[PDB]
Enzyme design. Structure first.
Site, PDB file in Angstrom:
ATOM      1  CE1 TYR A 106       4.946 -15.341  36.319  1.00  0.00           C
ATOM      2  CE2 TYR A 106       5.462 -15.154  33.984  1.00  0.00           C
ATOM      3  CZ  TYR A 106       4.970 -15.896  35.052  1.00  0.00           C
ATOM      4  OH  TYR A 106       4.507 -17.165  34.885  1.00  0.00           O
ATOM      5  CG  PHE A 133      15.394 -21.296  33.583  1.00  0.00           C
ATOM      6  CD1 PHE A 133      14.308 -21.091  34.424  1.00  0.00           C
ATOM      7  CD2 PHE A 133      16.429 -20.375  33.604  1.00  0.00           C
ATOM      8  CE1 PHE A 133      14.253 -19.981  35.250  1.00  0.00           C
ATOM      9  CE2 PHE A 133      16.368 -19.263  34.427  1.00  0.00           C
ATOM     10  CZ  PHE A 133      15.279 -19.066  35.244  1.00  0.00           C
TER      11      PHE A 133
END
Ligand SMILES: O=C(CCCN1CCC(O)(c2ccc(Cl)cc2)CC1)c1ccc(F)cc1
Ligand SMILES: O=C(CCCN1CCC(O)(c2ccc(Cl)cc2)CC1)c1ccc(F)cc1
Ligand SMILES: O=C(CCCN1CCC(O)(c2ccc(Cl)cc2)CC1)c1ccc(F)cc1
Ligand SMILES: O=C(CCCN1CCC(O)(c2ccc(Cl)cc2)CC1)c1ccc(F)cc1
Ligand SMILES: [Cl-]
Ligand SMILES: [Cl-]
Ligand SMILES: [Cl-]
Ligand SMILES: [Cl-]
Ligand SMILES: [Cl-]
Ligand SMILES: [Cl-]
Ligand SMILES: [Cl-]
Ligand SMILES: [Cl-]
Ligand code: NA
Ligand code: NA
Ligand code: NA
Ligand code: NA
Ligand code: NA
Ligand code: NA
Ligand code: NA
Ligand code: NA
Ligand code: NA
Ligand code: NA
Ligand code: NA
Ligand code: NA
EC number: 2.3.1.-
Lengths: 391, 391, 391, 391
Positions: free
Chosen positions: C119, C391
């Site tokens: 990322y 999450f």
């Protein structure tokens, strides 16, 4: 295949077979030291010429119940070459040594077994029990009742030989399983107390007037101290030494190979901290002369005088009378009240196994449950049976 | 903090404390079954209102040497909330239950200890020894002497309840440590015999007229069979069941939690194959009434009549006369010949620990070594002490 | 390959890709709950027709230094089918979602990374640090200075939802890294608090007026308690909860995933007992709008007013003035004094990484060591950065 | 028990206690080398005669924030015989050495702790943090930003002593935690660089003009390289050395004991590959003279001038004024604004622990949160605190 007493020429070939047979082989120098305990006709070799089988015995002195010391033939250095398995070489060598041992007038033979399934058929029964205790010393607290709440000294083993010899000599005369430790075995013990490059760490000793402990830190587990030997003549000495071992603040765990009646657990507020991590047969006994062995040991004075007829399978039948802590054991053709193989008598002889437990496995056979209770009580040892040193 | 007998309203709060305290918590349905063994004033709770402490006892029947059955208070479900440690809640709850147990006329209390360092100070001594044997059955061969060289049936446990009940009832009356197993505990046992999704595998039984074994394959080690329970009334039954277990050809290993005198090792040609893998305290005993407990059990007939004076620390001093396998135990102010804490008497009471071993740790104190040998012999059990079922 | 917002028809195919991609996949029922946090155009799918790629974001509220709450796009449910690797599908999906997130007016995007190497190239920097502490509670003693030497209650989580919600809501507003936990995520949390057949054990809670801890015993290690979540608003609450957890007397070890500045070690007499067993990146941040994000957070009042020129690689160049704990961040073509990739700014933004440490790896580039010290001090957080929920 | 400075005659007894106390004991030859760092009255022994307690200090030079070098008493070789635990010998020896250290004019004492729970009560606080990183080098790729995409040489350590000495001397003067490494410790280090029969493998070095790394392959894990020491004076040197270590193509893993702010993770495209496998206290500090120590170190220039009143528990109360990176620390009877034990000040002193974190554990006590933020900023170190070498 010929079975002979070895000449000096045979011993290099015996050391080759030994090195290939025993991963713990002490080497030719140490082997030559132990050899001083082997009498003149104490060894047999099988030649095919090269040595393909060997067996010997050493002259030992074994303490039995009643502080009686028996001349004992200690079988050792028993090996068959991996090239000559399943040719009856062990049976031939054991038969010849037993002939020589019996003719020499030994009442008892003894050994430490490489495996548990081998020596029963040659009449050896396991007679002492090794019990490894591991103490997590971080949690260990002594009971308010524990003796000696400093009598103990941290010392170099090689500097206090005289003191260890004197303490061990007192211990071995009082404890069934005790063995006389000759000068050559003290030489060997203090040599193994030294650090080895790539091997064991340095040994230290805790010395009390009435006891000692030899210990070293494990090669690989640096939070484990291994007690190689603890000999205590008094309860005060036993407790004082354990107070010192529990004071090894850099260790997590102390391990010792001891006996099932070691009082260590009862010295602590948590008996569970003295964990049994391992249990195995120690010394094995073959009763060579049934009446000599049975008459020689002491019996419990608590049991009232009783008479029975004991048959040993191919070992004779005897009128056995036990009273005032002594046995008389005479030939008889009267009906047997008790029958057992020779190995079973060896297991009973130092008090490590109950007649009742052997009877429940049908190794010992009687129709009289009262006789069983009387044998159990009579053969029990006042002083718990311990294991001296492996040979 | 108030200490009360719980109302029905308190039991949800007790089940919360139980679930948070016991990883092996059987759950509210099973807990409600066991509750049927708790008498009317058999439970105490501490409220802060929420339950922060609980303790109860169950009405048990314990077999002691001489096949004597004693009413026994079985302490269980003892917990203090993790929020209320170090506030004397355990001491307060134990003091109240002991008051009620003594006033109710129980001569003995018993428990299974979560840790070894807790219950000694409340007068409980470890009285039975758990011994795990692991057999590598691939190597196991029965001795020529072993009985029964087919009397045993492989069956579904739930289909032979009547037979297991009858065998267990005969076993528990003959063996010191034996407990009456009420109908509700047979319901619970046969419920745990079923396979659980994500849990235990199906249990099977080996059934003999005079013995049974319940076993299952381990959840994770699929080459290990775990014997949950083996009850044999005869040596023939014990051997026959072990012949069947050693016939579990898909297993490498059979494990059982048994007692130190299990004859299994002696049934094999290699006694070493029956390896001791674990050893721990089993049942703990608190002698509530010293003279009642000492007069109630049978003693070895092998020891000749003797008299002594026994002092229990804050438990009274007694003239103790033992002869013809019976004890008389009367109040005296004569000088003590033997002193010990109450916990020590519990450890001696079923014959699992020798007076001589406790004396060597100074838990038992006398100047007379002859008295020590006499106590050792007298308190010994003819039938080895076993552990019935945990509670 | 076409890139589209999914229709209702696509979601079964997305649940198949999810089940095959995520071993921790919560299942379609739970996934449908979390879906309520995904806005109307918050999801993209790639179709080849079957779903071979997916990505979405949820509407979150993230607390940053100065107790400022930012609307945050939480990337989640990102997967490429194992059949369609190395075809630029991740890059295409991330580019489209970032377009939508920026156009929607989110100043910041966030995610939890499946792997550490993915990322950074899309402008996400690790912004919080997960720190697992394992306490051997058997040795744990609280320092004489530790608060609260009972305010805490052992409770069933499902019975005190309101209290946990209220405590968490106070915690998340005060702590950088804090996330608003919507009603659907409280539903999901209390559902995972239940025991599962073959799965997790029952969860318990310790409840204080100003803090709670949710914990359960490990599935397989029955001497380990795993704290899933501890939220404390005061030091008194934090200490009181840890006193209760250390009171879990049946456990050997308590483990918690916490942050590097957890004061737990300093509560104990031996700080070493709180062992760091694991450390990993937690929340990752992508700064979407540099001036909006830099103006929105609070800065340390200890550093004196200073001005610089910050260039973000393909993110703009800004005149940055920091004073009185506030930043002004305006467009400039003046020479850059500081250069860094967008991912680096994300790593600096919550105070988890020092400008000086990033500079030493040449991820942050300046010729002024004084500027570096000023950035370090300014970007530091008074309240240590924590991780809310994954999450 | 008498407490004396040892005579030459005592040192054999001290080497026995050392060998029995320290599994890592360097042996009498190495011990005699280190002895050259112990000043004339730098050692105490307890005799019972045999040595049952010992402690000494070495003359060290410790770098503190602001590149200030303090004379430091390095406590070492501290042991109590396992026979003499719980007799106050450690307390007596520490009290005497502290008397001598304070009277000699040392502002600071330091040690490496055998256990974490011992030295807090004698006023030592952990002041540096050891952080083990393990890199799976098979996956490791350097970031496009990483410096130096050959300046490094693979060399034999014993051939480049001069270069390592010069680099280390530059490193230790710039880094808080830095220690002067005397000639005798360079002798000892290069002796341990040699392969040992049954022990460590050969050490190699990577040499840069501005840095070096000493490493060896693990004794037992032949796919693990252990970096014993990496000293880099520049970021270019640090990166270049790590490029070389990641080039050890025969290894799976590289491990190093480093500090929490090691930039290594940020040099890689996947920061997660630099895994924290272990974390522990390193150097412990006892502030002997509060005003001397507080006036001697440099403070952050970012914090504006402030005044407070600091009380050290039984260490005095001081007016503390910090401004322009300097402290003035004078006696006062004014009301304390900050209170802490002496150990806490040691933990704050090199910048390894935040005042705010210690305050959250109530080890540091103030009613002013602004004062807390000011202390945090002031005591912070511009150059991250590192650990030099264990003693
Ligand atoms: O090898 C032996 C005796 C075994 C020693 N020994 C083995 C293991 C040990 C431990 C480890 C303890 C005893 C021998 C005996 C007689 C002879 F002539 C030559 C050699
Ligand atoms: O919980 C108990 C008794 C423990 C059962 N039980 C635990 C472990 C097992 C094994 C595994 C064997 C015995 C109880 C007792 C009384 C009551 F009212 C409610 C509950
Ligand atoms: O799957 C998710 C979110 C991951 C939940 N979740 C995974 C692991 C856990 C732990 C273990 C904590 C968080 C999702 C998101 C949006 C959507 F529309 C459907 C599903
Ligand atoms: O023993 C010592 C100092 C410890 C050395 N040393 C132990 C472990 C190492 C590593 C592995 C690093 C440092 C000493 C000090 C003074 C003296 F007079 C005699 C001996
Ligand atoms: Cl005897
Ligand atoms: Cl022994
Ligand atoms: Cl009896
Ligand atoms: Cl049993
Ligand atoms: Cl802030
Ligand atoms: Cl966190
Ligand atoms: Cl500074
Ligand atoms: Cl370091
Ligand atoms: Na004796
Ligand atoms: Na010799
Ligand atoms: Na041996
Ligand atoms: Na019976
Ligand atoms: Na039931
Ligand atoms: Na139990
Ligand atoms: Na805040
Ligand atoms: Na839901
Ligand atoms: Na996750
Ligand atoms: Na510097
Ligand atoms: Na030297
Ligand atoms: Na050290």
């Amino acid at each position: 295949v010929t079975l002979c007493s070895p000449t000096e020429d045979d011993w290099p070939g015996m050391f080759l077979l030994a090195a290939a047979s025993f991963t713990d082989f002490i080497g030719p120098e140490s082997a030559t030291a132990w050899r001083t305990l082997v009498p003149t006709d104490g060894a047999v070799v099988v030649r095919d010429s090269e040595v393909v089988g060997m067996a010997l015995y050493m002259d030992l002195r074994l303490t039995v119940p009643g502080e009686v010391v028996l001349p004992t033939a200690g079988l050792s250095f028993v090996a068959v070459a991996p090239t000559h398995r399943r040719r009856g070489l062990l049976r031939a060598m054991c038969a010849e040594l037993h002939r020589r041992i019996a003719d020499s007038g030994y009442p008892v033979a003894a050994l430490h077994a490489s495996e548990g399934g081998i020596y029963g058929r040659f009449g050896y029964g396991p007679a002492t029990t090794l019990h490894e205790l591991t103490v997590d010393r971080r949690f260990a607290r002594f009971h308010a009742d524990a003796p000696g709440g400093s009598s103990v000294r941290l010392v170099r083993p090689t500097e206090h030989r005289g003191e260890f010899e004197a303490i061990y000599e007192r211990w071995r005369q009082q404890v069934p399983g005790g063995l006389l430790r000759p000068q050559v075995l003290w030489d060997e013990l203090l040599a193994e107390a030294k650090a080895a490059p790539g091997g064991d760490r340095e040994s230290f000793a805790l010395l009390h007037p009435d006891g000692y402990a030899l210990y070293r830190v494990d090669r690989t587990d640096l939070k484990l101290a291994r007690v190689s030997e603890l000999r205590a003549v008094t309860a005060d000495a036993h407790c004082a030494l354990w107070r010192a071992l529990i004071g090894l603040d850099s260790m997590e765990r102390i391990s010792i190979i001891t006996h099932p009646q070691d009082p260590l657990p009862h010295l602590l507020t948590d008996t569970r901290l003295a964990r049994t991590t391992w249990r195995q047969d120690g010394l094995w006994l073959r009763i060579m002369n049934v009446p000599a062995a049975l008459e020689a040991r002491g019996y419990a004075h608590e049991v009232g005088e009783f008479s029975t007829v004991l048959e040993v399978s191919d070992g004779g039948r005897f009128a056995l009378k036990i009273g005032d802590g002594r046995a008389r054991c005479t030939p008889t053709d009267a009906a047997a009240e008790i029958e057992m193989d020779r190995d079973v008598l060896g297991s009973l002889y130092l008090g490590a196994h109950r007649a009742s437990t052997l009877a429940a496995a049908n190794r010992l056979r009687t129709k009289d449950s009262q006789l069983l209770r009387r044998l159990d009580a009579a053969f029990a040892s006042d002083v718990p049976v311990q294991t001296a040193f492996e040979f």
